[PDB]
Amino acid sequence: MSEQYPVLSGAEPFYAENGPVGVLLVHGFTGTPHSMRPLAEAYAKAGYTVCLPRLKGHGTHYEDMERTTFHDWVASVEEGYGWLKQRCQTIFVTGLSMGGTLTLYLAEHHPDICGIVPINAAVDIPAIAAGMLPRYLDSIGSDLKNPDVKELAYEKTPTASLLQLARLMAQTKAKLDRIVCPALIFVSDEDHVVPPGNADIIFQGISSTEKEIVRLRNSYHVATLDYDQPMIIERSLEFFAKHAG
Ligand SMILES: *[P@](=O)(CCCN=[N+]=[N-])OCCCCCCCCCCCC
């Protein structure tokens, strides 16, 4: 039931103990903490306590991922949330792609979360249903506008894992109205992976009175590492300070 392969260089989780306000950062499907690290480091430098976990079956080998279910990915996030609760009075959650899905999921099950920052979060990806063949699909290159960036992601995607994601997304979509905390929803106009309309499914679905969509015009899907990174960091910091206890 445990991972059989070692953690890849660059895929290590990140923890920083600072003040009583904490931020949980969640990476995406087939990705690793690498996707979120620049944000995590910026938030720690600003005085936040920070938790950037490595999702089970991620950052090792796609064969480990194939052996996980979405419950394992939820468990990794719950564990990180729990780490923060032991240290913080105020907790924010942010995440990219499926990390954004998991951000929404955690807020749907924990009303104490003080605010969320989903980034190109996924609750409906029609491409999965369309395709739903081989045991592993060749991964397409990382969707970044800046070609110089090196993202860390599995070279193959187990198709069985796509079914797990679809289940997680379906459950998350169904429960959106449980979210009442403030929300800052980032979306890349030119996301070629997660259809940008997901931003509006989320905006309309949640019950929050304080919510907004910020469109990113200079990034593709992996916006946390792309040209609009500085803006994501700056606006996220403003959001944390505004809503912190
Ligand atoms: P995010 O967590 C990360 C996207 C970048 N990495 N990748 N992969 O979104 C995960 C879901 C992406 C959409 C998957 C569509 C696959 C369609 C293939 C159809 C085969 C049945």
Side-chain angles (χ1 to χ4, degrees):
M1 229 127 214
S2 58
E3 295 158 351
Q4 297 186 13
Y5 288 79
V7 179
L8 295 168
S9 181
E12 305 86 358
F14 174 78
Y15 298 81
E17 293 182 320
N18 289 304
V21 184
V23 180
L24 181 63
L25 302 89
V26 193
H27 70 78
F29 178 90
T30 79
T32 80
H34 180 82
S35 303
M36 302 295 287
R37 196 180 310 276
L39 277 60
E41 293 180 348
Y43 305 157
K45 179 72 175 184
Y48 294 89
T49 286
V50 168
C51 183
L52 165 47
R54 180 182 60 79
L55 298 179
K56 190 167 190 195
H58 286 69
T60 64
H61 191 279
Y62 68 77
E63 287 173 8
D64 283 339
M65 187 180 179
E66 180 170 37
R67 283 181 287 264
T68 66
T69 71
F70 77 83
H71 298 92
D72 295 307
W73 311 330
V74 171
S76 295
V77 182
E78 282 279 355
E79 172 172 2
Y81 164 75
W83 190 85
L84 288 168
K85 284 203 78 160
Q86 291 275 326
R87 292 165 175 81
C88 301
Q89 310 310 297
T90 301
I91 295 170
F92 296 107
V93 188
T94 183
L96 169 72
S97 206
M98 189 184 70
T101 312
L102 290 162
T103 291
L104 298 164
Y105 198 84
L106 199 73
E108 294 166 346
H109 294 89
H110 300 282
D112 53 310
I113 288 170
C114 291
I116 58 173
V117 186
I119 305 164
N120 294 320
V123 297
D124 195 347
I125 305 182
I128 303 185
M132 285 301 158
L133 162 84
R135 191 176 187 135
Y136 312 99
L137 296 171
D138 282 333
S139 293
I140 190 169
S142 287
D143 187 38
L144 280 146
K145 196 174 183 184
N146 183 356
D148 291 342
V149 172
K150 290 152 186 307
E151 170 63 311
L152 215 164
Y154 289 146
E155 67 276 26
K156 293 193 187 311
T157 302
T159 60
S161 297
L162 288 165
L163 289 191
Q164 294 295 325
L165 172 64
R167 292 172 169 170
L168 172 65
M169 286 189 306
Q171 293 188 21
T172 303
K173 187 184 179 176
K175 289 168 173 181
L176 284 169
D177 67 345
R178 300 188 192 175
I179 300 173
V180 298
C181 65
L184 163 61
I185 304 163
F186 287 104
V187 64
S188 293
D189 285 349
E190 297 183 71
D191 192 326
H192 309 113
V193 177
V194 175
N198 273 265
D200 309 84
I201 302 172
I202 295 161
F203 180 97
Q204 290 294 331
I206 66 183
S207 285
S208 312
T209 55
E210 299 185 66
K211 49 177 186 183
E212 64 191 313
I213 295 172
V214 173
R215 297 176 193 287
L216 304 171
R217 270 68 181 262
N218 204 20
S219 294
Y220 297 166
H221 176 69
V222 188
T224 54
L225 299 182
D226 220 344
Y227 297 124
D228 291 311
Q229 179 193 97
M231 176 181 172
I232 291 173
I233 293 172
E234 184 175 45
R235 294 185 185 275
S236 295
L237 287 167
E238 289 186 354
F239 176 92
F240 300 154
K242 176 177 169 54
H243 299 296

